[model samples]
Target chain A: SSPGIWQLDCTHLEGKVILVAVHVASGYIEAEVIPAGQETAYFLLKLAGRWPVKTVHTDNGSNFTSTTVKAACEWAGIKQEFGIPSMNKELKKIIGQVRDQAEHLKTAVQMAVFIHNKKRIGGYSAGERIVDIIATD
Target chain B: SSPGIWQLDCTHLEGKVILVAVHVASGYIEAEVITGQETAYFLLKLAGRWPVKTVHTDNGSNFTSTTVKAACEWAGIKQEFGNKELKKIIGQVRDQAEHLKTAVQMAVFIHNKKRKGGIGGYSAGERIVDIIATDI
Candidate 1:
């Protein structure tokens, strides 16, 4: 089974075109800006190119709910999951730990993607051919 | 003309009451709270009992608007105008001064009122009364 985390920030600068995607098992993350909600699938495809992604976890945003992203995940043989709405504490802590350094490393928009990828460590370590590297403080 | 300042903390504890008013020239201040916007007129009546000739104020969500204008005029008073928004420069200066002071001399809301009154005095009293009255 494949697993990964996906976070999205729709609050900054009136929800403009910015998104981040991460594969937690490999500590791989990507950032992109697509027109409104049009290119979510394209970004997911970009992430797939970087890692062997099986599960995609996202927040309950209209863009994530769009048919385009859902169709892309389905075609790519990836399962999709969504986290609770409006809660960022756990997500922030997870992303902060993954990024290693404390000061100004991740913007909210970028961290959303970082968090999803970090959570994939569990899936990767379970006989899933993923390496675990110690995070330096 | 006589003038006074008034302030209400809208975000105080849910059920707590807050009302502050200061006499411009005498430095006398009064505060009270009653239920609802309709009760504001009663506050005006109580404040009116003081020798207030004019009311100098900023354009807050309450007090200096259309609904309260008629009642204020009927109180045999005039409302001197000031800015509707807080001045960032003055706010920064106040924050710095407040940090150096051992004790907070005036509440922010009340100080805003007094400052507006001081401005009124400057436009009318040739800077003399404004300087002396606001020294405290």
Candidate 2:
């Protein structure tokens, strides 16, 4: 069975890291501003709580390529791939918009994430955002 | 007196009133999406916990009506017409309305909590609380 694919990336801004993850299937997004290089295993574990992290598509950045990230992906039965340039562009645009007007990066990134997650996807029946797609064990 | 001058206004969108109150002294805002025409009175009551001495508003029926006057009178506050500063912020808040009340509240909350360039890197809520809580 094919699982949902997520495009992930992190950009350095003002000595901090702005990590963004977008679910390709639903266009659902999650973003955060965290200390640089602390998002490796942290992101996968955090996102796994909200969605099934079967396969993550990211660039060949050191954060994604770290041995720690690889071990976490293997232990969690997840596959990691490299790609999602357009997704990173959209996420960077959001980060730029948010950073320009926001004084606090952490909460502002979260606010952006909330706003992005609450919008309707192109193929959705109704104007809706993310619906929890995780299965109960 | 620890009296604070604040601004109150309401705009109608999709049959609901977006009640907005801004503390003129600190730029803090309180906003709610409400039903009916008792916009001023309801906002006054909700913001009453703060030390407000005067409320500035536009000459709209919602703010000029008899009930609103009495509400102001009963609360010992002055009402006047007033600022488009809040207008710019409220315009930013008009983008979403699926959950009208929550969106309005969240926008105002963010505005109040975020640091303002006008206030020299202090948040509106922080400044307001700092001003109101200090004893002379």
Candidate 3:
């Protein structure tokens, strides 16, 4: 943890964080393992020439809501209802549920998001397949 | 437009898409123009060189993922999910949307690194480096 110098456990560590991005509409999701910080260059990469990405919903995290990320979210010249705040809460809930089943934490979060995006849930919007997957117009 | 029904208009952005990282301890920074899902790779590379205590980013899908989080944890790097106050700084960057790469590099070298001055006038690089300072 020294400046410009460091190391890793590779064998697995306890304090882990998962960056999950839910479709916010179709429940379609994906994730990665990192700090999930909103560095402009990093955030802009997420906005890179793909989806309409008109509007974005972000947490209070600095990287997530910086001038760079915010301005970029206003990116594609399009728009949407943004992400529902409850979306994150649902991820946490799903993670907890999957914990009982998956052999590992990463697997737990992964399986939870996978199931949330697919499968016919209790029936509602959540049950729908990933049709409009990108949450764009 | 405001809150809920608010809609954004990007008719103005160049959308050049650049990525950046700064060593909080030192003003040392790194950047590049990029496309979707490259933050993890960038950060990982950065970790190979600079020391990272935390990476504070938004909830964007690219930033929010298992691979990124795992990499950070595995590296013993902390990712701080701190917020909104970050908006103004981002907005400033937004205003300079064009040629952000150079602008960032310029800021880091000139303003952030040189003029900003670390404790007692030592530059960020000077203070953080284990050896003697090297400057042009």
In order, candidate lDDTs are 0.40, 0.56, 0.41
Candidate 1 at B78: error in angstroms? 76
Pitting candidate 2 against candidate 3, the one with the higher TM-score is 2
Q: Report model 2's chain A TM-score.
A: 0.72
Model 2 regions more than 4 Å off: A61-64, A85-103, A121-137, B1-136
First chain TM-score for all predictions: 0.50, 0.72, 0.50
Candidate 2 global CA lDDT score: 0.56
* TM-scores for every candidate against the unseen true structure: 0.29, 0.41, 0.33
Per-residue lDDT, model 1, residue A67, is 77
Task: Provide the DockQ value for model 3.
Answer: 0.02
Looking only at chain B, model 3 earns a TM-score of 0.54
For every prediction, compared with the true complex, DockQ reads 0.01, 0.02, 0.02
Clashing pairs in 1: A2-A55, A5-A116, A24-A117, B2-B54
DockQ-better candidate, 1 vs 2:
2
Tens digits of per-residue lDDT, candidate 2, B45-111, equal 3332355687776766645476556556545677776625544544675563334553454356556
True contacts kept of 2: 0.00
Candidate 2 lDDT over A1-137, as tens digits, reads: 12457777776656887777777765666665666532466556445533456788876667554765675566455678776536546545665676654345654454345445533335431102223222111
Candidate 1 residues B2-62, lDDT tens each?
Answer: 2344333322222544344444554433333333333344333433233234565554555
Candidate 3 lDDT, B34-117, residue by residue in tens: 533255445544443333556765445544576666656644566655412223344566455465543433333333334244
